[PDB]
């Protein structure tokens, strides 16, 4: 007996004997759940970690060429204390306006001489076409002078030509919390 | 690490995908009529709240997640994307923003706003709008957008109101 | 005050407790002796409040 | 064996896909600028290897896993495939038999020879070559190839060399 | 009778082609540094001691000599300045940096370049010189790039 | 020693230390198998509850 084996009145039954037959080992069944929009992952920074972000608004890109842009940081972290700081792992994503000319990418490596030639070596890329208009340079650029960074442009492709201000992208960039966050200031000056 | 013999079993439409509320965050929800779009443009409404949850009293409530997905007619023209953000300047600025999206040609036609509006005031809303871009032009009500929020139940429904004042 | 030794106020728990947004309708008062130009001078303002939460975590990649 | 309930997460661009070297086995890359290529054809290079490990030294070590990817211009010009093999006498014959081929029509565009090179000499690569076949024809440096190679640290980085003989 | 290099310390060496000068004068060159370290990410790195030497053709001018220094003003003052230097009438055609520069940005040196000085003027590509030098061993060195781009 | 670590004569073998590095949890392979038509599930109704079902066949529809 087995599966349902349970029946009336009388009925023998024999098998026979080999080497067996079926797999070695067994199945398991699932069932892949349907996520919307955002329910996704915004993994949490690590320790003594900040995440500071920011977005940088688009300039007229042409037909099918990409263009760059020395990335600045904001005053906060734009001291020379803290611009001798050290990055974690950090992404670049971006948000543009519905109604879109063709698909289009973008990445970032350093200051790029050739401005095309970027796509050719960054570790990630922000793919249109793709589900996850992102890239994630995790560990890509982990520690570095929270300056450094400035002499390193970041670059954009456009399959159609199109305006400025076309499209924003963020850069939620992991590095060393500062200590200004804390403590207030000195009274006596 | 030998593999896994699986088998993705297959979903069918509003099957499953049960999404558990948290406790004393209680969850309202309603929805607003599209008007009618143009083509490629994206309209706003400032948030269509419900009277029910007006009176300052709760109306100076907080917030956490918040679903936001849309029923639109068969006929549907193309394809939409949809959003919110807060009163945003620009129309369109507010895609370029938003941490979800619901769009036409997703599986699931929704977007999420994790926690992205944790604590903010049930009127804290009303400052907020949503928007909704279309493909091809359209007409109004052509669409109807489901703002489902979480947040907390109040001091009311618990009861009625003075017999003799 | 100028006059003073600590050009500067404490408002401990003076203001404690406020939507970060309240203090928006509050303006700030300044006097002046002499007649005075503009850009003049800066104020800072220290301020206590709740740490937010975007200190930390990244963003969904999933949009 | 009970349904599992589930979810697939999404992966954006450069995400995890760690993939750790093997012990004493160091792995090494560079790449190779492409010569432009006609339509269909399909170009190839001797390993151009580098300099650094020319040493008859280090030149005369072993391999293992090789990976092989591309960075092509956003303005990729409609899709290509690339590979290896040994010094092809037929150009096109070389991907009538790789284990691996990096394509632009793939997620992942990029090739990995497991162990298919295993416990070669760093110099037995040079009689090897890359072959690269274009849909429409096409600059050159129009592509580059990303040769990442794994094997071994020698006798040298160690350290520097004769001060007075 | 060897040498060794330090603890997770990487000694990256390569050369750079001269560029034919005159004589009695010395030119400089800012420095070609690798690009697999070229990356703000491990051009930040650390450097241990550093040398200098110095293959040319054998068939080659009155003895000469060179060095390095911060981006210096003077190149003939660079000599002045110079740590150690690879001199060609010693029997040690080379220069040791030792501790000289130990513990320094790896994209430091790039502001600074290196001084060479000839008795009679000289070609191009006529000389070449190698770097040997000491930097802590950064990270991928062992492991594969993610396939997913 | 690890993998296949097993070899002739001598040769000696170090690393180095610092922080880790490896993802923190491992991988699991798997196989998604081929499903046929009807495969799927019916699941099974509940408590003295019936399924009770039948058809109703279409009329005309336009455009
Ligand atoms: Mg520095
Ligand atoms: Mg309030």
Redesign the interface.
């Known amino acids: 007996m087995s599966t349902s084996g349970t029946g009336k009145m009388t009925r023998a039954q024999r098998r026979a004997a080999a080497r067996r037959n079926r797999?070695t080992?067994?199945?398991?069944?699932?069932?892949?759940?349907?996520?919307?929009?955002?329910?996704?992952?915004?993994?949490?920074?690590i320790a003594g970690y900040?995440?500071s972000?920011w977005?940088a608004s688009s300039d007229a890109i042409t037909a099918?060429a990409?263009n760059a842009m020395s990335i600045t940081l904001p005053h906060e972290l734009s001291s020379e204390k803290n611009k001798e700081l050290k990055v974690g792992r950090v992404?670049l994503?971006?948000?543009?306006?519905?109604?879109v000319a063709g698909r289009?990418?973008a990445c970032v490596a350093?200051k790029q001489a050739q401005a095309?030639?970027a796509?050719?070596?960054?570790?990630?890329?922000?793919?249109s076409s793709?589900?996850?208009?992102?890239?994630?340079?995790?560990?890509?650029?982990?520690?570095?002078?929270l300056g450094?960074?400035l002499?390193?442009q970041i670059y954009l492709?456009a399959?159609e030509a199109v305006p400025a201000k076309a499209?924003?992208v963020?850069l939620?960039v992991?590095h060393v919390?500062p200590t200004f966050?804390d403590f207030?200031?000195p009274?006596?000056?």
Do not use: C
Not at 25 to 31: G, H, S, T, W, Y
């Open positions: 797999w080992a067994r199945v398991q069944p699932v069932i892949v759940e349907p996520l919307a929009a955002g329910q996704g992952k915004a993994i949490k920074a900040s995440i972000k977005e099918k990409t992404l994503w971006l948000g543009l306006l519905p109604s289009i990418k350093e095309e030639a796509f050719q070596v960054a570790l990630a890329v922000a793919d793709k589900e996850v208009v992102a890239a994630m340079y995790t560990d890509a650029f982990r520690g570095a002078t450094d960074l002499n390193l492709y399959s499209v924003v963020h939620e992991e919390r966050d207030f200031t009274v006596y000056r």
